[PDB]
Amino acid sequence: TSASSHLNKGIKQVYMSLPQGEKVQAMYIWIDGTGEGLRCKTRTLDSEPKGVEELPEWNFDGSSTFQSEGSNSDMYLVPAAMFRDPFRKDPNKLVFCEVFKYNRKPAETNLRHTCKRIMDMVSNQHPWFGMEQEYTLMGTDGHPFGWPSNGFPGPQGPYYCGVGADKAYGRDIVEAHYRACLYAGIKIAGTNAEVMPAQWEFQIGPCEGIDMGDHLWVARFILHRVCEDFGVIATFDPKPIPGNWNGAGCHTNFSTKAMREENGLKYIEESIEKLSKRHQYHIRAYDPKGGLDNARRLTGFHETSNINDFSAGVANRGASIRIPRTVGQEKKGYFEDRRPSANCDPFSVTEALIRTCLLNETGDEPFQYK
Amino acid sequence: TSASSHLNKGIKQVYMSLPQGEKVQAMYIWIDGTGEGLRCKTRTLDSEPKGVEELPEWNFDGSSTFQSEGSNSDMYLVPAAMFRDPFRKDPNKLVFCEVFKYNRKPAETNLRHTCKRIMDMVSNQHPWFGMEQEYTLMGTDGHPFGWPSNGFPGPQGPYYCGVGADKAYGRDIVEAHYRACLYAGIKIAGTNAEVMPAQWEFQIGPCEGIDMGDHLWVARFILHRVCEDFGVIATFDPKPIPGNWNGAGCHTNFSTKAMREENGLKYIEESIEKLSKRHQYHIRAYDPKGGLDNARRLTGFHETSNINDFSAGVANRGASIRIPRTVGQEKKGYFEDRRPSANCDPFSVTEALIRTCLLNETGDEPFQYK
Amino acid sequence: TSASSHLNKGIKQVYMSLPQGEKVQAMYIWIDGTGEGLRCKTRTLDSEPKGVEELPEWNFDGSSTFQSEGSNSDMYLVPAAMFRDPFRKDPNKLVFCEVFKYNRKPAETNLRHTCKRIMDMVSNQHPWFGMEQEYTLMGTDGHPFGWPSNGFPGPQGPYYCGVGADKAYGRDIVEAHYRACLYAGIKIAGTNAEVMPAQWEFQIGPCEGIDMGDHLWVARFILHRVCEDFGVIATFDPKPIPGNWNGAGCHTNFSTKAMREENGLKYIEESIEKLSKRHQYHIRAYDPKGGLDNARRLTGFHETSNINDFSAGVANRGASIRIPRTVGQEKKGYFEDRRPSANCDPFSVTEALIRTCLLNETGDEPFQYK
Amino acid sequence: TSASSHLNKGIKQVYMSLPQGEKVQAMYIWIDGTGEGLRCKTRTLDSEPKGVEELPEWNFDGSSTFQSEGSNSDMYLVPAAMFRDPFRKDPNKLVFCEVFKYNRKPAETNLRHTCKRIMDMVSNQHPWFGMEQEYTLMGTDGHPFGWPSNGFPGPQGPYYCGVGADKAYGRDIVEAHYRACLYAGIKIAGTNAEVMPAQWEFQIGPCEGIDMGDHLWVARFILHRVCEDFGVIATFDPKPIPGNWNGAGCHTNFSTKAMREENGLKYIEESIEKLSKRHQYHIRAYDPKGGLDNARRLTGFHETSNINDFSAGVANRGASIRIPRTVGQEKKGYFEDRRPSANCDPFSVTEALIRTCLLNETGDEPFQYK
Amino acid sequence: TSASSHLNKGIKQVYMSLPQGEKVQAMYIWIDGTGEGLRCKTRTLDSEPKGVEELPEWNFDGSSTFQSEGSNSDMYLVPAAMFRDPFRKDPNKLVFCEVFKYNRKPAETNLRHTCKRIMDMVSNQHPWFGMEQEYTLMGTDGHPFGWPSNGFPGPQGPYYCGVGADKAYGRDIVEAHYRACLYAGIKIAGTNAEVMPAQWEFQIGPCEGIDMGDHLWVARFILHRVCEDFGVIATFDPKPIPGNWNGAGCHTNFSTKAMREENGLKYIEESIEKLSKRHQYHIRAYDPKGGLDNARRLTGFHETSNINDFSAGVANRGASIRIPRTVGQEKKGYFEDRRPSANCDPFSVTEALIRTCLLNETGDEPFQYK
Ligand SMILES: [Cl-]
Ligand SMILES: [Cl-]
Ligand SMILES: [Cl-]
Ligand SMILES: [Cl-]
Ligand SMILES: [Cl-]
Ligand SMILES: [Mg+2]
Ligand SMILES: [Mg+2]
Ligand SMILES: [Mg+2]
Ligand SMILES: [Mg+2]
Ligand SMILES: [Mg+2]
């Protein structure tokens, strides 16, 4: 539906296949003042950087990104992770950044800074995460892509992992995103068409520590750019359509070295225990509005837990935490936190998990350290 | 007609020609709780599997696929056949699966499990099947593709194996499907435009034993993915348009080693005999609604048998079973069961043929064994 | 204008460029019960046939092609000529066939069978034919392609061999057909935009004996397939638009070894003589409705002969037979029969020429032989 | 949506307001061989008939209306009820007819003939009926009028007796029909928007005896003519949209003189008793397919009775028969048979009610009389 | 569909309702050189003529109407019948004319002149005619009005005397025409929707002698003017759509004083006898191409006689002549000639009936008289 999507793409293609020369493009990516939106810009480099360390710091105007007031508005980008650019091909790069203010302090929405620290504190336990990112394809009118105009498709049931024109809306986006990620070097585990038509999932992982946040964010950025090409919107809102229509969540898989090795199930249950005593804290960390967004998703019905009550169970689709059936069988593996909203900050989610399960914190606020 | 079909396909193409790296995509395919619909999803692998045995088991939510109730909804995928992915190219794969419940028992629609067994019991007789899969191309409105809006093309006659814009609607699907099959390694024997405009056939075979089911199902899946690309629907309904318009059937060719070698015609007639005493049982097995769907097709008129009466004949287009003229000439070969509906499960059809013709069963229910 | 022509062709292209493997596709082509229409279907082969002789016989349902009654409807295809498939590329093939009934007798419209014989009877005289196939491009509404909606372009005059957007309608079809033919191995001599806009010609020849029919027919098939891709219709009707608008004919060039060598003009005049005595018989053979179709073309006006009167002349555009001016100059060469309708069967036209000019038959019916 | 609906209506209007002169138009209306469809034609009269008795008999071709075989196809129309023509205004007339064969026997779908008799037999008891005719407005594509294209509006709830653009689809039809009926002299009691959007009701009654059928049928004809003008279709099908969408029924109110006068409730319960013993017979008479159509409506859910089980209750929306709450209060009035399909023949419904309740018949077939 | 039909009709209306003054418009109508088309033009008069006799003769250019050669092209209009103008209202007039050449001889297509004479010769026998004029409504593309684009509606059966949007295409034309006729003073007997959708009939009669031709012709003219306003075309072609679709005829009813009075059936059979001996002559007179047009309608199938064979019968829908069942009953009345094509000249049809049945002519050419 978007106007730019109707421009002649063959023309872009023609320019895109000009041999580019020795110079190299770097697209810097970062997180908005909203804690949800991504921004980016591009600079030329003199040659292909061999790793993230070779990339210059950069800056931008924070008052144009909901990130500062008048006089001291300038803000700083510090390269954190680097990937191959699937939009421009090699030698070009995507550069995920951290955001700092003028006084070189982390920005309000720079959650990576603190999370990176917390992950270093527990590196010997080798924490691994996986995330199931759900999203919904929308036209520029805000109506789900490929839904009848001002209407509803038929009821849920045929669309989950569906195939065929009447079943799966917008697969091209999925397919393209998937390769884009592979090429970029993102740890994309797979994908499926979700329960609501025009709703899809991709899985990212397994990722060690800080890597989880980095990979999910960049995957998200790639999804936006791909959607942008096709002229549609990806929405990470946890409940895009009110009523009998699936919400979107961000299921998180977690395991330590302990949990993965034999009889790890013991440690799994131990951390589930600590979690049960910190439900309220985790909901606060599981979406950028402190739990207000997730409230519309976590209702009990439609295979969700209630936002108010903690619960756990082996192969329990309706619980706050699920231990996979076969994880229960072999008494080792990982568990799944089904609480995080589709629009959560993965840095916020992974940090909270470590704090509660591994550094045994309690109270209503994150302990500060050395 | 579909909205996704109007997205810019050149854009998908751009991404699809990124070099993918060491990782590999596997699309798992399975059968719905409807016994008619296919589902699928994709996971990443670390390298190209060398055969179906190297592929992990997987699971999915059965309550989203008409396949279970609340609490123990999780279900299991066991790789059964592997093919090259024509939608993603090498090294990627299609993985046809069997479906099992949480208690590791076959799902209601997993007819492969039992059919596999029965096929093993007779492997020395080397049973070979061929199936003629008929289908109709529909727009997203449910009207046959390329038919006049709310209307009818001219009467049947010019469309069977027709050529020209006024004669063959939607050949592109046919052409693409055919290659997709070849590349995938599906045993596609040929194809033709059928009697009703927008209606087509492909032939799968000859296939030994369990292979028949596997090949036809995956062929079907491929057809759906291809149609999906083009924005149309493939319908396997046995009578998509009421009245003077061809139904869609799934003619099945059958032969044993005995029947193929000299004077096999004797054995052909012997099994036709056994079949004549079990019409009612076969009708039950020849469509997923026990014969209610086929009732709309098998009416006697339009070169179909009557659903009520068994009949056989040499080169008899109107009979339940047809012995090909030249099979009658050379007194060896195969016979054609013209009864199965275009939407039958090939596992159910092939099994019923073995049970009646080879294991000489009678009665109203399949014998159980060792 | 056709609906299928609006499908995304890039998508077909993607599938069509999958490497196909060892298997090979053969499209069998044949003639309708109408004696005008072409039919076809496709089977897989295990490897590339090295010549027409390596191709299996086949069958189809004659009651679906205006070719038989109820009970014994099955009919037989016997490979006659093979070409490379320009729609699928090497190693794939087009297989022009002859049609036989269940009792292995020639079908009513299988005119090749008898023509083949008659051509063998005179092979020492090396008869050579060339045919000028005229045709008109039509939209799916039946109005000539690129004509004004419910209207007429400006009057004839600027279109014959015209160039420019306001002059030549539908050249892409012509261009593609031409190459398709070349690749196939069809003996295509050339082409031109004809007098009526959206009307074109291609020339086939020179062809020895039976080859003429085979080449023209397959050329026609190719034209229909090409038009099919583009979404338009090729019509061979001799008078597609009533009134001051050119008819379409199938001018036939003929020569024997005798006529080609020095002072052959003598033999040319001799056969023209025999022809003058058999006008009525020839008109019957020059269109599939015994002369009813040609009646609408051959009116005397618009550089046509009258259907009632035979005439001949050196460089005479308005005559039944034309001796090219330069054939008259050098007293050797060929003559042009300007009588055949654009929709004639070339087998019927070539046979009739041999019979009258070479086997000196007279009477109202073809002599039977050994 | 219909093409004729897009013609310039102001032009018709211009002609329609020419003063017509002394002559008068009579439109004869009758029932199809389908028992569901209505037919009509118009003849000129020399002056305004003063009552139904003054109107000539007429005929038509029964083979064109699903009503006879070859040779003796002519059929007869006998004027039965007359109304003022709301499409043409005074002095013009609508003339509802009975249909007879060439041998002056009633036609198969002429149920009025026998019903008229049965009504005469009980005239002293003054039977009064009321019918609640439900129907759905459809576009010419067969999709409910004003529904999203290939889609569904939001769920039921806001549409029953709704007001506003997003609530009541197609009220113009309702409004016009209502006046049309009033003008015609039809006994139209009222109307409402029904539960499913684009679904409406009008009530006809109270009508004495044979009058019920006459008035409902003519009301139906008027509805079709009005819908015709607007370009939409009225459908009397009992279950136009499968699933969670209201069926359409034809609730029938019934009372005798006995039931209306004080303590009539006794007689009401007496006839409900007789009815309870003849459910099966009544289902047969409550739709033209003997109960096959109603089977899709009467499922128990969505405030319907089950087609299999008889039931009765005071103010019971889910029962086969309902005694209005206030009829139960005052111990006199009428009861409501909720079983008849929206596409029933009122003649068949009213006759069956008389036969069971008043002439105390039992058995499986209507008693014949004098 | 026509461009003029899309002009703002309300604007015409504004002008049309200016009070016109003392002057009066007369539209003269006449028959083309084709014997099928009608022409007209308009002159102002000083006051309302009181009858046809007060109207001036007039002239027009016959070379512009297919009616003469170069030098003496002028032709003459002689007022024959006058009617009120339903397009302009009172005091304005339609004036049907006879056409004469410069030498005051009747024009080739002026069949009225001779017919008038023949009618005078038998006036004492008071011959009465009725004609059933069938016609088809077409869009400006030549496709039947309201049919699917390049397609066909569903099969015949529901359309004869149909009501509802999906049944009766273009009723507004019918309705307007009917009133137009009434107002003009045309003897319009009635109308009905015919078997083929978009096909309609109106009946004209009974008319004495020359009056028949006058009334039918003027009715036809009115139909063209009305269709013109609505932007569609009325076609009187006897077979507008090839194949399984009803032809259009012009059934003619005939009776003399003798036949109408008691035991007239004797005379009816007498004239049917004379007719049986002159089939060939009548076919020549029953369409303007001497029978070539009717050849496409009269085929035996679809309730038509064969063009080759005469036949008669009581209530025989498939015969050349039908005696109505009730005419056979009461042994008096009229008979119906079902042979005339919908495009016949009524003057030619009525004259031929008189000549054969009343002036007992035989031979192949009309006797000349005094
Ligand atoms: Cl940028
Ligand atoms: Cl997937
Ligand atoms: Cl094919
Ligand atoms: Cl009417
Ligand atoms: Cl005028
Ligand atoms: Mg999920
Ligand atoms: Mg077939
Ligand atoms: Mg030429
Ligand atoms: Mg109601
Ligand atoms: Mg008629």
Side-chain angles (χ1 to χ4, degrees), chain C residues 132 134 194 201 251:
Chain C
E132 293 175 16
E134 299 187 326
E194 268 289 341
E201 194 170 311
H251 294 176

Side-chain angles (χ1 to χ4, degrees), chain D residues 105-162:
Chain D
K105 257 148 197 172
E108 331 296 318
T109 59
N110 177 350
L111 300 200
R112 190 184 185 273
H113 184 69
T114 315
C115 186
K116 161 76 169 174
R117 255 162 191 64
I118 301 287
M119 293 290 158
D120 290 335
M121 289 179 52
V122 298
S123 44
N124 342 83
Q125 318 192 40
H126 301 293
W128 285 5
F129 301 97
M131 293 184 175
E132 293 178 13
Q133 176 70 77
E134 297 183 335
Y135 62 96
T136 311
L137 294 179
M138 312 278 259
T140 50
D141 55 14
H143 202 61
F145 180 76
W147 276 34
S149 214
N150 277 1
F152 299 85
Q156 304 195 128
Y159 316 106
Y160 182 74
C161 303

Side-chain angles (χ1 to χ4, degrees), chain C residues 319-340:
Chain C
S320 295
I321 306 289
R322 177 180 138 271
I323 302 155
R325 202 191 281 304
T326 95
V327 163
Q329 310 293 319
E330 308 166 353
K331 313 199 155 186
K332 52 154 177 176
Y334 65 86
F335 65 102
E336 183 191 65
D337 194 342
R338 310 189 113 232
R339 290 169 306 167

Side-chain angles (χ1 to χ4, degrees), chain C residues 240-312:
Chain C
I241 304 291
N244 264 356
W245 298 101
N246 258 39
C250 204
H251 294 176
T252 308
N253 300 315
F254 182 39
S255 74
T256 51
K257 204 191 188 188
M259 292 186 248
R260 292 193 286 280
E261 286 161 22
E262 214 56 53
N263 288 293
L265 172 55
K266 193 212 177 191
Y267 297 89
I268 286 168
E269 269 146 324
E270 266 170 36
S271 20
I272 292 167
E273 193 54 34
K274 296 158 205 198
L275 280 173
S276 64
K277 272 146 209 154
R278 257 157 93 61
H279 184 69
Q280 207 63 338
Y281 174 92
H282 277 261
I283 294 312
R284 248 176 268 121
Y286 282 8
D287 81 63
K289 281 177 147 73
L292 269 34
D293 278 339
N294 234 337
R296 300 180 284 105
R297 178 170 78 106
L298 300 168
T299 59
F301 321 115
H302 315 270
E303 314 135 46
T304 54
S305 44
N306 195 295
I307 197 182
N308 297 312
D309 328 307
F310 188 96
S311 55

Side-chain angles (χ1 to χ4, degrees), chain D residues 34-37 220 235-242 246-250 282-299 304-305 307 339-345:
Chain D
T34 50
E36 294 192 64
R220 285 169 172 182
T235 182
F236 296 135
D237 186 89
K239 187 77 176 173
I241 303 293
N246 257 36
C250 207
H282 278 256
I283 292 314
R284 246 175 270 119
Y286 282 13
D287 79 64
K289 279 180 147 75
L292 268 38
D293 277 337
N294 233 341
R296 300 179 286 106
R297 177 175 78 110
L298 300 166
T299 62
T304 55
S305 44
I307 197 184
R339 293 170 297 171
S341 162
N343 74 337
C344 67
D345 183 336

Side-chain angles (χ1 to χ4, degrees), chain B residues 7 9 13 86-87 89 145-146 157-166 168-173 175-176 178-180 182-183 187-192 195 203 225-226 229-230 232 303 315 317 325-326, chain C residues 2-4 7-9 11-12 14-20 23 25 27 30 38-44 59-61 63-66 71-74 76 88 102 140 221 224-225 227-228 231-233:
Chain B
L7 288 173
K9 294 323 188 151
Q13 204 29 55
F87 312 111
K89 297 172 174 234
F145 180 77
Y159 315 105
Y160 180 75
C161 303
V163 72
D166 54 344
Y169 308 167
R171 184 192 297 291
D172 299 300
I173 283 76
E175 295 287 331
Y178 207 134
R179 298 294 219 75
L182 291 184
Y183 184 95
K187 201 145 170 58
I188 178 167
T191 25
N192 60 283
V195 168
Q203 298 90 49
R225 264 303 259 96
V226 170
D229 280 359
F230 281 107
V232 300
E303 316 132 47
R317 292 288 178 171
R325 203 193 276 306
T326 93
Chain C
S2 112
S4 323
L7 294 170
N8 187 305
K9 297 317 192 165
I11 277 179
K12 191 209 195 204
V14 162
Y15 290 91
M16 288 310 272
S17 55
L18 293 174
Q20 91 194 69
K23 311 274 180 199
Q25 301 184 279
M27 176 165 277
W30 68 99
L38 292 157
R39 307 292 179 114
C40 69
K41 55 194 220 172
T42 287
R43 60 187 296 156
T44 319
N59 59 277
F60 66 88
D61 181 332
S63 74
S64 308
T65 65
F66 310 121
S71 39
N72 290 301
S73 56
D74 55 304
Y76 293 91
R88 295 166 176 157
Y102 73 101
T140 52
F221 176 84
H224 291 320
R225 263 303 257 104
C227 291
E228 204 199 278
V232 301
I233 289 153

